[PDB]
Every structure is written in structure tokens, then in C-alpha cells.
XYZ file of N, CA and C in Angstrom:
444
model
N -47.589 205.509 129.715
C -48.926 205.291 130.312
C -49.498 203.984 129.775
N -50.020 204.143 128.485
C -51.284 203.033 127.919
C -49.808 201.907 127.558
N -48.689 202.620 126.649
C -47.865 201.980 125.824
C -46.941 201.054 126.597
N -46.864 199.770 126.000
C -45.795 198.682 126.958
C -45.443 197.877 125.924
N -44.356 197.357 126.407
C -43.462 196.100 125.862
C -43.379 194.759 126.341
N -43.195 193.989 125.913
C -42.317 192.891 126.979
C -41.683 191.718 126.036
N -40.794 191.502 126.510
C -39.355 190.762 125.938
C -38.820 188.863 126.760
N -39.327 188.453 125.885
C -38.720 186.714 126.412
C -37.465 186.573 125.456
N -36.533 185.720 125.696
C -35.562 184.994 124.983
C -35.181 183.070 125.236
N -35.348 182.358 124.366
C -35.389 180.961 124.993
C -34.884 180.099 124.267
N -33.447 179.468 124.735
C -32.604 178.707 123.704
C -33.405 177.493 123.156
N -33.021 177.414 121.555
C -33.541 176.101 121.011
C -32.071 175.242 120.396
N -32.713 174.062 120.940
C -31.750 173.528 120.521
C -31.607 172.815 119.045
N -32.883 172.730 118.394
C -32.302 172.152 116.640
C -32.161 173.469 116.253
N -32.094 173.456 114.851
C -31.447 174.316 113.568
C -32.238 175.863 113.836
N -31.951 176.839 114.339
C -31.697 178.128 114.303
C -32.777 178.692 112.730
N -32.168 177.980 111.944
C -32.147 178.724 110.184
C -34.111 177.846 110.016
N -33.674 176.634 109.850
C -34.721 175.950 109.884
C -36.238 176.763 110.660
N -35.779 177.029 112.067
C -36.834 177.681 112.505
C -37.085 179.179 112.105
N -36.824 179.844 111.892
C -36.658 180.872 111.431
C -37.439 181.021 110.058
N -37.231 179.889 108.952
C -37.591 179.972 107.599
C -39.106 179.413 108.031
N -39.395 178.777 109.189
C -40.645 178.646 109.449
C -41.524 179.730 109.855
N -41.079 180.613 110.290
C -42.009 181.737 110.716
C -42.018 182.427 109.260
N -40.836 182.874 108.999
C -41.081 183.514 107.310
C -41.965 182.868 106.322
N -41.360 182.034 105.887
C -41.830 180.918 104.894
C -43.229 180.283 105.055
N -42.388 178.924 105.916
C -43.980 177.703 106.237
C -44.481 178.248 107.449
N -45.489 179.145 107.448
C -46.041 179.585 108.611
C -47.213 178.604 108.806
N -47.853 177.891 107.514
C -48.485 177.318 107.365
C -48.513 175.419 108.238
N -46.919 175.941 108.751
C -46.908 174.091 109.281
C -47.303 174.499 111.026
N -47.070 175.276 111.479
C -47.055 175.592 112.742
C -48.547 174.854 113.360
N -49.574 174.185 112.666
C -50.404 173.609 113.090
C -50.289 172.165 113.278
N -49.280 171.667 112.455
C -49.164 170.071 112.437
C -47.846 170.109 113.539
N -47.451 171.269 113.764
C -46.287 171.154 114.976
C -46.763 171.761 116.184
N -47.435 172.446 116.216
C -47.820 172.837 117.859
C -49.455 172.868 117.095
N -50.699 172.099 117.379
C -52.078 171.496 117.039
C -52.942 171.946 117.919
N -52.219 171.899 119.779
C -53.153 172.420 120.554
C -53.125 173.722 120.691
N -52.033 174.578 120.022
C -52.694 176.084 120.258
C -52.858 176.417 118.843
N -52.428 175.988 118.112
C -53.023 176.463 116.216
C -53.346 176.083 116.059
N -54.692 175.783 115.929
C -55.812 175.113 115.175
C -55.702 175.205 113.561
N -55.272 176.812 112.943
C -55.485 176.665 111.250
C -55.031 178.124 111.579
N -53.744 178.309 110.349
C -53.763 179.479 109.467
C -53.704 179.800 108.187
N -54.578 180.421 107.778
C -54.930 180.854 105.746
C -53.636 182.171 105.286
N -53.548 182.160 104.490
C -53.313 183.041 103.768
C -54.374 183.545 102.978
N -54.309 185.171 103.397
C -55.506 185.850 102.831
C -55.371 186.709 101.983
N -53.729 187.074 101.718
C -53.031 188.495 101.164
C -51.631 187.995 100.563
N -51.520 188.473 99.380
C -50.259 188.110 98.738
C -50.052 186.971 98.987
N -47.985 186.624 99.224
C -47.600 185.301 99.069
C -46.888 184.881 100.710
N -47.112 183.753 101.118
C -46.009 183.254 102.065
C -44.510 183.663 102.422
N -44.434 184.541 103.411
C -43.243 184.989 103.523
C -42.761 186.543 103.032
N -43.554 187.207 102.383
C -43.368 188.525 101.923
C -43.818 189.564 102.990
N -43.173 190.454 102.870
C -43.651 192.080 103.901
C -45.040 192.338 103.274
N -45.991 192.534 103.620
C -47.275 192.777 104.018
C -48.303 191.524 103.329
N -47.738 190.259 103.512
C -48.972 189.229 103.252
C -49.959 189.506 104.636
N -50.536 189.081 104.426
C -51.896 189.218 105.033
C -52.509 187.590 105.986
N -52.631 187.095 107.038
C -52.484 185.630 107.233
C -53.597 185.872 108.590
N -54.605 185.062 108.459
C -55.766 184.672 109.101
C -55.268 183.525 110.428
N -55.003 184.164 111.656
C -54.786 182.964 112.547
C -56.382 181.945 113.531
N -56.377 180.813 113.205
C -57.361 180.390 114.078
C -56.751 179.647 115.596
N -56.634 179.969 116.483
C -55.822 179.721 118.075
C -57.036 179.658 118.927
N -55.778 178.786 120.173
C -56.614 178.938 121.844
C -55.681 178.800 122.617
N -56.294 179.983 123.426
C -55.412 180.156 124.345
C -56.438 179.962 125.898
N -55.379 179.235 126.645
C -56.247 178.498 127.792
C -57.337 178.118 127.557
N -57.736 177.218 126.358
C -59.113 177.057 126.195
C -60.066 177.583 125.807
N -59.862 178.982 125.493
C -60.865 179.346 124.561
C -60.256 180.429 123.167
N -60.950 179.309 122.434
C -60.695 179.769 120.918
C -60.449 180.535 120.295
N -59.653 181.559 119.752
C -59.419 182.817 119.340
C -59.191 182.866 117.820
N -59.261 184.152 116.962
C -58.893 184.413 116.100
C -57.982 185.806 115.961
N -57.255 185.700 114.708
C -56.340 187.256 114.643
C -55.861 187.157 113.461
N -56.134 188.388 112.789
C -55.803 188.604 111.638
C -54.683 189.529 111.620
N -53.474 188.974 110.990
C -52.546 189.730 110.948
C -51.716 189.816 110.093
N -50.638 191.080 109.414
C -49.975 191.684 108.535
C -48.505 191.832 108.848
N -48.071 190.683 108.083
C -46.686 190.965 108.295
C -45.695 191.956 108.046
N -44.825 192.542 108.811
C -45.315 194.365 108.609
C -43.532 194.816 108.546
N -42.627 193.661 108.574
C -41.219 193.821 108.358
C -40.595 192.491 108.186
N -39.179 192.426 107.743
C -39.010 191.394 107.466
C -36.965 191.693 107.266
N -36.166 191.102 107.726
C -34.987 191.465 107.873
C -34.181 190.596 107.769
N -33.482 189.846 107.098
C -32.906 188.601 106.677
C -31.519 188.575 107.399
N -31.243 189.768 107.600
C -30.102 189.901 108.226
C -30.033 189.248 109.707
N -30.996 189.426 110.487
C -30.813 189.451 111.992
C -31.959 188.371 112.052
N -32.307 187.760 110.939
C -33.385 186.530 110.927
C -34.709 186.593 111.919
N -35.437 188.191 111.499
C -36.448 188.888 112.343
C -37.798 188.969 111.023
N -38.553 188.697 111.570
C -40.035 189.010 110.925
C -40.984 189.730 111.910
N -41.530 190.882 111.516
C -42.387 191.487 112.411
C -43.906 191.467 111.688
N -45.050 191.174 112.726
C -46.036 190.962 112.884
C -46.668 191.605 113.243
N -48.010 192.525 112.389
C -48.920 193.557 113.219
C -50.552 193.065 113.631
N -50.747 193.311 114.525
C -52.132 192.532 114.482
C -53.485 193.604 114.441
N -53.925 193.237 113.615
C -55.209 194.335 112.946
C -56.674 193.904 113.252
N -56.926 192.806 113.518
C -58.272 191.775 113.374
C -58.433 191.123 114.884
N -59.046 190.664 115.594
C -59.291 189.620 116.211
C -59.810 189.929 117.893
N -59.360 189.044 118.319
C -59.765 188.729 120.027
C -58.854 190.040 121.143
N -57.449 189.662 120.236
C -56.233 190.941 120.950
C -57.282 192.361 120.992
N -57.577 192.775 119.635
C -57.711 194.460 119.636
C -59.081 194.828 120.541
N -59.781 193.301 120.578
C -60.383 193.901 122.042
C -59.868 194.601 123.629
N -58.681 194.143 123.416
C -57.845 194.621 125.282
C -57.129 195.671 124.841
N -56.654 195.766 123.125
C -55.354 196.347 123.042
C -55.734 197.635 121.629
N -55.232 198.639 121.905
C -55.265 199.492 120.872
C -54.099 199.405 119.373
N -53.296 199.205 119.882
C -51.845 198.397 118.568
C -51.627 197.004 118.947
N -50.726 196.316 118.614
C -49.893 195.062 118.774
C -49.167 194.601 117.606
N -47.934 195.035 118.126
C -47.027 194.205 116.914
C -45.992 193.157 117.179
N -45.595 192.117 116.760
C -45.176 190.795 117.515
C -43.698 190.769 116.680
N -43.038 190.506 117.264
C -41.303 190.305 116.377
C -40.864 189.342 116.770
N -40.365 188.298 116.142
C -40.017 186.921 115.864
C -38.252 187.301 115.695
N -37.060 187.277 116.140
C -35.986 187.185 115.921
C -35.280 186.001 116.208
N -34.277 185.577 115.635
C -33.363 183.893 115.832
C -32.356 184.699 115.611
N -31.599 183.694 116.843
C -30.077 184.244 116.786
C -29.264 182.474 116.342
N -29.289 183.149 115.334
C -28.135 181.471 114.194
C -26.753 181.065 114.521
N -26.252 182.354 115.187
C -25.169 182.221 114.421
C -24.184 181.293 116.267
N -23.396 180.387 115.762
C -22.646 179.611 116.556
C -23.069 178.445 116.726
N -22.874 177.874 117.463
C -23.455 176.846 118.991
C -24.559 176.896 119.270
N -24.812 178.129 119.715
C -26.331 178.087 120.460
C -26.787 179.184 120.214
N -28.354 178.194 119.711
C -29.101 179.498 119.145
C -30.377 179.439 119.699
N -31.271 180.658 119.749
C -32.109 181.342 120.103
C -33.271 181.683 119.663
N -33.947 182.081 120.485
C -35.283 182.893 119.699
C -36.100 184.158 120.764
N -35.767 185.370 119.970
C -36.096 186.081 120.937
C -37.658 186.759 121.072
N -39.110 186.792 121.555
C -40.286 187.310 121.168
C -40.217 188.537 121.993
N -40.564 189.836 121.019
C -41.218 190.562 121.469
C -42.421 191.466 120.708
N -42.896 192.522 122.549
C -44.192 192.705 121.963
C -44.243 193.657 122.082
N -45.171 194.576 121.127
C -45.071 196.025 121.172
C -46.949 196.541 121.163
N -46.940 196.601 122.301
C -48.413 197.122 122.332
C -49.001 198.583 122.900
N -50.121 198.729 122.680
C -50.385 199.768 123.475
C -52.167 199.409 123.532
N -52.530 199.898 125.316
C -53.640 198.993 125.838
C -54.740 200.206 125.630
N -55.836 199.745 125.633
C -57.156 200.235 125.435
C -57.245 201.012 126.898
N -57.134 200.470 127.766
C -57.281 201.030 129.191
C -56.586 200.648 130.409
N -56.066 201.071 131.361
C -55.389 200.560 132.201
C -55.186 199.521 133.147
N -56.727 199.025 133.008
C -56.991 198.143 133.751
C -56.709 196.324 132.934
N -56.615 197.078 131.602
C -56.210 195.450 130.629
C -55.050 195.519 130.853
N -54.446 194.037 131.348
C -53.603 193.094 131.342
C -52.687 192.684 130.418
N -51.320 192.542 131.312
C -50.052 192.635 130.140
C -50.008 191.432 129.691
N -49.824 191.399 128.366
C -50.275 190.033 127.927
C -48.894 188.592 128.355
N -49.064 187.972 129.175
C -47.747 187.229 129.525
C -48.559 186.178 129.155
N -50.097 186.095 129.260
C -50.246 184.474 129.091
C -50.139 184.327 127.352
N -50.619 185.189 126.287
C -49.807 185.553 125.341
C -48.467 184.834 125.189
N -47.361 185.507 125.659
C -46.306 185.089 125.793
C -46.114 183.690 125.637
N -46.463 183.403 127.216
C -46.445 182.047 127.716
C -46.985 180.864 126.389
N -47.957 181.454 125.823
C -48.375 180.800 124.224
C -47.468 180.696 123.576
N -46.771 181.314 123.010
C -45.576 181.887 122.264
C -44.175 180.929 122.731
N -43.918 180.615 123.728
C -43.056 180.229 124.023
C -42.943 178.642 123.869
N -44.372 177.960 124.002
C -45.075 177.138 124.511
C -44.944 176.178 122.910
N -45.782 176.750 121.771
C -45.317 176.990 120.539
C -43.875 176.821 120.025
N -43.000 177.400 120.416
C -41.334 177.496 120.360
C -40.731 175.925 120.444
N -41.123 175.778 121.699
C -41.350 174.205 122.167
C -41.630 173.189 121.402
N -42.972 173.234 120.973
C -43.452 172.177 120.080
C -42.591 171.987 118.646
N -42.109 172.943 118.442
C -41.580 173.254 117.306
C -40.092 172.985 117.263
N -39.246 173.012 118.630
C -38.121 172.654 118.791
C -38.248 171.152 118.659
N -38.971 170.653 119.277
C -39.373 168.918 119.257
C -39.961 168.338 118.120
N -40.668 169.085 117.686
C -41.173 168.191 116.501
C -40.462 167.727 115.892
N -40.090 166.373 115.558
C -39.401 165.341 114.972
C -37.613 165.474 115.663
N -37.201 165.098 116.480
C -36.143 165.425 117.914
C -35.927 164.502 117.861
């Protein structure tokens, strides 16, 4: 009923590992690499890169400004996945949960990045988040290019 998913996958072409240690690690650069949709993120909880730091996002999406506070809520070195819960912000107005999973696929030639989303909506009439997505992907981008 309320509960939905949805699943992108989108080849990158620099370093797999590199990006990956950015979502774990330097989550903190994602503003000097994609500027027009991250404006600023803090660390508010524990350390960079650990299962349940705590990290203050300031974003915009289509133009208007958002915030989201969120808890990094898994973390899997194996399959180069970090999962993301979102507790705070602009989302839990449409949405009753949301949890975001970041996976890279390293290994070969060509590698990947797969987003998905695990939500469940306040009411039926709120909207599956694709422009979300479309952020997300958009992001991926900037980040594949930055310095190319």
C-alpha cells in the first residue's frame, strides 16, 4: 500500500573505490563537487564514515532549498554499500521512513553505482520520489567529472 521502493543503476567511468570512499569517508567534499545541489554538510554525531554518525545535509532540489538530517544506519565493505536513514528534514514531510543505499560495483572494467530507496509514504496521494532520484544521479555525475 503506503510502502515503495525504487532502484536506478548508472555506469561511472573513473575509480569505482575512489567513489565509494567518498560516500563513506569524505562525505564532506560532495559540495565542492556537485555545489548546485549541496550547498553544506556538518557532521553532527560521532566520526566520518562510521555506522550511526549522524550528518546534517543542507540541499536544493529544483530550486528550493532543503534540509535532512540523517543517520548512517549500515555500512558493508564488502559489496562497497553504505546505507542512509533519514530522520530530520523536508523528506519526512511526504514520507513516513526513508532509507537511501549507496552501493559501487568495483570490481573489473566497468563499474557502477547502484541508488536505492526504501520508503514508506505518509499518504497516497504523495509522490514517488524520482525527482529525488533524478538528484542523486545528477550528483553521481558531478562527481564522476570532477577533475576528468
Amino acid at each position: 500500500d503506503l510502502s515503495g521502493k525504487m532502484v536506478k543503476q548508472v555506469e561511472i567511468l573513473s575509480d569505482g573505490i575512489v567513489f565509494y570512499e567518498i560516500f563513506r569517508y569524505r562525505l564532506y567534499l560532495i559540495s565542492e563537487m556537485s555545489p548546485v545541489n549541496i550547498q553544506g554538510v556538518d557532521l553532527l554525531e560521532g566520526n566520518w564514515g562510521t555506522v550511526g554518525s549522524v550528518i546534517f545535509f543542507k540541499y536544493t532540489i529544483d530550486g528550493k532549498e532543503k534540509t535532512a538530517k540523517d543517520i548512517v544506519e549500515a555500512i558493508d565493505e564488502e559489496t562497497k554499500s553504505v546505507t542512509f536513514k533519514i530522520v530530520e528534514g523536508d523528506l519526512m514531510e511526504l514520507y513516513k521512513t526513508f532509507i537511501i543505499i549507496v552501493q559501487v560495483d568495483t570490481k573489473g572494467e566497468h563499474n557502477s553505482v547502484t541508488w536505492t530507496f526504501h520508503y514508506e509514504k505518509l499518504k497516497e496521494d504523495v509522490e514517488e520520489p524520482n525527482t529525488l532520484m533524478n538528484f542523486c544521479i545528477e550528483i553521481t555525475k558531478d562527481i564522476e567529472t570532477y577533475h576528468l
